Design an enzyme around this catalytic site. Structure first.
Site, short mmCIF file in Angstrom:
data_model
loop_
_atom_site.label_atom_id
_atom_site.label_comp_id
_atom_site.label_asym_id
_atom_site.label_seq_id
_atom_site.Cartn_x
_atom_site.Cartn_y
_atom_site.Cartn_z
N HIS B 141 0.81 -1.22 0.00
CA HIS B 141 0.00 0.00 0.00
C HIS B 141 0.83 1.27 0.00
O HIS B 141 1.79 1.39 0.78
CB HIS B 141 -0.93 0.03 1.22
CG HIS B 141 -0.21 0.04 2.54
ND1 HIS B 141 0.18 1.20 3.17
CD2 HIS B 141 0.18 -0.98 3.35
CE1 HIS B 141 0.78 0.90 4.31
NE2 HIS B 141 0.80 -0.41 4.44
N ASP B 142 0.46 2.20 -0.88
CA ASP B 142 0.95 3.58 -0.86
C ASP B 142 2.35 3.82 -1.41
O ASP B 142 2.84 4.96 -1.39
CB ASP B 142 0.83 4.19 0.56
CG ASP B 142 -0.55 4.01 1.17
OD1 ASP B 142 -1.57 4.24 0.49
OD2 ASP B 142 -0.62 3.64 2.36
N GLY B 159 5.19 -0.65 3.06
CA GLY B 159 4.27 0.46 2.89
C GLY B 159 4.96 1.80 2.70
O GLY B 159 5.95 2.08 3.37
#
Lengths: 288, 288, 288
Positions: B141-142, B159
């Site tokens: 994620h991200d 992340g």
């Protein structure tokens, strides 16, 4: 709500409100609890039971036709292409032997994980409750995993590894067969763990070394100010006694038991017991 | 050219000359550009768009039914069993939140890769153009990934990792959350990268250490003779100033800015800025 | 015994007693030997031949439509979602070039493995007989693998890696392109192997270092008492000659040839030859 294209054997036991997507297969001896959901092209084989409200993502394979069972509790999510309850990789596994896998409740097993059945009929691969097992983790035959653990991507647990509760492993950890990981432990990224990690402790780097207490984890899990102060003192007495009782590990352990001020603290007593267990029959000692 | 066995929702938006093999599924809110090709048993879910001439190999899964979108550019190849645009593993992710993934053009994402959507609606996982992402890579994620990067097998980007342009990671690299990897950097095999890797530099081994400039990469990418000579001199002034200004990193950085001979070179200025960025709010410093 | 849902091209060559499960696809130019079994949703593409009694587990993909062939012997088991005989990741691979993969007999290739075809038409990826290749292993273009090897989970063999017979790699080993691994060698967990591992030897830890002979493996493989005694003496003369002939590796090798007592032993001679090969044209030397 079974898609017409799915192959669902007439003897599969399908609970109420179960949803089965296109191109799934469900074998004759599968039982699915109420509310289970199989996404497209997911598969359940062999003597296999899922509890209520489990979810199989696309490509997920649960169970295999080998004798024995795969038994899974309620509210488990099995990620894309995860393979759960298949034959172990142990060369000592005997063709035709029953083999076993038991998984509890509320676990999340992410994409590309592989969880293997036991290597012998008397044994079992066991996973408890509320575990997060991230992508591409490997859980070998006969592992015993407790509750509330977090295994980051590519964690490899070799045969007979035992993990207690509330542990964290960072990405690409490798844990050697028969090693134990105590509650609230932390294993740093890319660690090759070849001995036990005691309760409350952290290991890191290359062939992994002990690095202290997992203080961040202890803080996060509601350990009190003086609890952690006692544990740090006990840690110091055991591992950082640089001037006294040379070439004697057990004598320092003994001195901690006798130290009534520290030993009367429940966490200290649990930590000391955790350490001693690593030197009982067959056990591998502790990381250096 | 849609195989009769495929499940293609009537509301999927299918461009001209799209080929769909047997046992594929395509959801209601998918848009496929002209010339896309889905090999047998590949899948597109959720609010998902692929540009022209993308290819999904067998078992590939793109998108999921979580709110938000998976948006992919043109001429991308998604390898066998790759899982692209699925729910993140962040425990802080809130059920029902929109989450986002954006991929540019001309990328190759190989077998068993997992690319996750963002952890919050305000953020996004981003991949640029012309990247080669080899088998079993994980992009959490991200992450923000630029252009022309090469990630070897089993590269794990945790992340919020940021990767710029033209970087190489060797097999089984592990990059810690929030770390930055500057343009033209090289990460050696099995490196556990827990701090930033500045522009033009290389890191390697265990918990990874800085090892110098990525001179082979610089040479391969059309850096001139004196460009690389200036960068090496700047590197020496910053990191290998063994006798002067003890216990001061910023003072050496300052002395480089003032050195008009080196600082007037564009690459030197870019490198110096890259380094300073690692010590601005929230950033993790640089590898040792 | 072909399930009615399976897509089996009329020109596929299907032997006697072949079983094909639901949602499999078999291409026009595939030949399956007698007794092959394809579990549900397994796939064979391209110019591809499997010998008698091979097994494809669910999700397994063998072959691809690229020119050249995938040729596999008898009694091979291809695990769940394994991808065997697909395009290499080498950027020098030229579009439209023929590429090749050859696998022998009685191998076990476990879940999520990826085995790539050659990078050029003159070359080939080769795997011998009786190998165990555990979950999530990567075998790159042009590797040459012998017989009776065991590769633990997440072993990555980069391009042109050569492995002989009866070797073991522990979990998450990474072997650099063009490296050679001699017979009966052992590579410890998480080792990053960037040079050759000679016959009978073991390497371990971080950027991997030589650590001695693989004595446990030698014992297990029927090496006699005095065979292993001779090898240990030869090892000592070569690597642990701390006081004599400073800054000279070849002179110590020479002194071993001349030592008639040790060199007349077949294993010693084989070991010495194995070492010398690492310093012939293009070869990468040996681990430190």
């Amino acid at each position: 709500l079974i898609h017409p294209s799915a192959v669902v054997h007439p003897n599969a036991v399908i609970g109420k409100g179960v949803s089965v997507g296109p191109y799934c297969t469900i074998g004759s001896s599968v039982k699915l609890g109420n509310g289970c959901k199989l996404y497209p092209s997911s598969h359940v084989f062999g003597n296999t039971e899922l509890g209520e409200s489990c979810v199989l993502m696309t490509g997920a394979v649960v169970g295999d036709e080998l004798p024995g069972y795969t038994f899974i509790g309620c509210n488990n999510i099995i990620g894309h292409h995860a393979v759960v309850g298949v034959k172990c990789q142990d060369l000592k596994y005997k063709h035709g032997d029953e083999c076993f896998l038991c998984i509890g409740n509320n676990n999340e097993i992410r994409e590309f994980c592989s969880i293997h059945r036991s290597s012998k009929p008397s044994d079992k691969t066991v996973i408890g409750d509320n575990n997060l097992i991230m992508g591409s983790c490997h859980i070998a035959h006969d592992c015993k995993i407790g509750d509330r653990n977090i295994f980051a991507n590519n964690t490899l647990l070799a045969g007979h590894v035992v993990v207690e509760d509330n542990t964290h492993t960072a990405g690409a950890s490798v844990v050697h067969q028969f090693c134990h990981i105590g509650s609230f432990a932390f294993i740093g990224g890319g660690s090759v763990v070849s001995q036990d990690v005691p309760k409350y402790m952290m290991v890191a780097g290359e062939r992994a070394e002990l690095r202290g207490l997992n203080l961040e984890g202890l803080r996060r899990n509601g350990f009190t100010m003086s609890e952690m102060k006692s544990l740090r003192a006990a840690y110091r007495k055991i591992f950082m006694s640089t001037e006294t009782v040379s070439l004697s590990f057990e004598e320092r352990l003994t001195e901690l038991e006798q130290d009534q001020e520290l030993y009367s603290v429940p966490a200290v007593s649990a930590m000391l017991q955790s350490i001693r267990d690593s030197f009982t029959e067959s056990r591998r000692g502790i990381c250096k």
